[PDB]
Paper text:
Platelet–endothelial-cell adhesion molecule-1 (PECAM-1), also well known as CD31, is a 130 kilodalton protein which belongs to both type I transmembrane glycoprotein and immunoglobulin (Ig) superfamily. PECAM-1 can be divided into three parts: extracellular region which contains six immunoglobulin-like (IgL) domains with nine potential N-glycosylation sites, transmembrane region with one single α helix, and cytoplasmic region which possesses two separate tyrosine residues (Y663 and Y686) described as immunoreceptor tyrosine-based inhibitory motifs (ITIMs). As a cell adhesion molecule, PECAM-1 functions principally in cell junction but also plays a role in leukocyte trafficking and immune response. Among adjacent endothelial cells, PECAM-1 interacts with homogeneous molecules in a trans-homophilic binding manner that does not rely on transmembrane and cytoplasmic regions.
To avoid the uncontrolled glycosylation in insect cell expression system that might impair crystallization, we mutated three potential glyco-sites on IgL1-2 (N52Q, N84Q and N151Q). The homodimer of PECAM-1 IgL1-2 displays a trans-binding pattern that relies on the interactions between IgL1 and IgL2 derived from two opposite molecules. The two IgL1-2 fragments are packed to each other in a face-to-face antiparallel pattern with the side face of one β sheet. After analyzing the interaction surface of IgL1-2 dimer, the solvent accessible areas buried in interfaces on chain A and B are 1079.0 Å2 and 1094.2 Å2 respectively, and there are two types of reciprocities consisting of hydrophobic interaction and hydrogen bond. On interface1 (IgL2-A-IgL1-B), residues including K158, N187, F188 from IgL2-A and L74, L81, E117 from IgL1-B form the core of the hydrophobic interactions, while N115 from IgL1-B forms satellite hydrophobic interactions with I190, R149 from IgL2-A by donating C and O atoms on backbone to reinforce the hydrophobic contact. Similarly, interface2 (IgL1A-IgL2-B) residues including L74, I112, K116 from IgL1-A and R149, P155, F188, I190 from IgL2-B form the hydrophobic center while the C/O atoms from N115, Q84 on IgL2-A and N187 on IgL1-B form satellite hydrophobic interactions. Thus, the hydrophobic binding core surrounded by hydrogen bonds gives rise to the homophilic dimerization of IgL1-2. In contrast, our structure shows trans-homophilic dimerization of native IgL1-2 in one asymmetric unit, and the last peptide chain 214–228 in IgL2 does not swing out from its own architecture (Sup Fig. 3).
Numbering used by the authors:
A (entry chain A): 31 to 65, 68 to 228
B (entry chain B): 31 to 65, 67 to 229
Write the structure that this text describes.
Amino acid sequence: SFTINSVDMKSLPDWTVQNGKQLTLQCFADVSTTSKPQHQMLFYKDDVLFYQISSMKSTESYFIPEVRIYDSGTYKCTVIVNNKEKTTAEYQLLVEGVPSPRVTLDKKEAIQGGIVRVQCSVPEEKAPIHFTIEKLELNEKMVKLKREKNSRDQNFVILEFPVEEQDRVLSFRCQARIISGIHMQTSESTKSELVT
Amino acid sequence: SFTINSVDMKSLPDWTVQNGKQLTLQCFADVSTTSVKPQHQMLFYKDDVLFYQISSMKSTESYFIPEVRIYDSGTYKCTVIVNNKEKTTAEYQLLVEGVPSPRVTLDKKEAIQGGIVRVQCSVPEEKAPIHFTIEKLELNEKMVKLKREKNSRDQNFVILEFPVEEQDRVLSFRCQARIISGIHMQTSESTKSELVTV
């Protein structure tokens, strides 16, 4: 006969992981037998099934090449043998850090009084993302203007910016934030362009 | 100077699809411009949640689902960006039809009187929520000896224990699964045979 002794869920490299790395989720099962069993394993994230495998081996794995904060959450894995169950404790996977964001400008040469639509997207992540956008000024070395913006439905923003008669050479720099249980920030990003 | 004329979102073969088949979602954009081929950024959403992101130079981009499942069914919209101008498709309602035949599993191949038989019925290609029906059937009798209904909010399978009567010695169980969408879908049967001793 059989015995589901106990069940684990290891996380390689850890239950906390730097954004961008690869991550592996394991489901271990200790099984006692009197001469060899097939397992069925179900991986849940937040009690929603996302992977299913039936194998002869006691450790089963799930590979994430590129961890993202959207992957962060509550993980449990259930193992069935000969229609007997047992369920791992809950495991909280924590993803840290935000990739540098992508800034984009409709113009690279702009006129005075006019406008310049500036996009800032974190393409490798999903909403909700908070942005901070500084309008920087080169011939003066001073931040003219800052915009905070919260992006509920999207992972990007397009802001209109006015060309004040005040200068001719300027760039915009951006920085994004996302949550994992506490809060995560990026490095900056910029692109240059000029005014008449 | 660019102008996004319009954007659509076609579905191959259709916005209604049989469970199990391959499906292609396209995001098209009509672009008029006075210039220089433009760069596109397209965002595929499901239920107003993003699932695919791609930047291309051609106007049509695709997303392939090799085996559609009802869990993939939902509201699909796609918004495309060119030169930091937006436009978002209408919403599209994709509908998936049919449930795969379920998979029945028995802890015993031989059971003794009065004892139990744990019966699993799983639909592994689909996710919760699933309604199951498990009948204990009889070869020498062909009448339903016993039925168990069960709804599974959390799981894509059920394990019901069944009693072995003394009335019989060889019996099989048959199962059929249901999932609802506002419209509900049924499966075919599944069975596996096994017997009893004194």
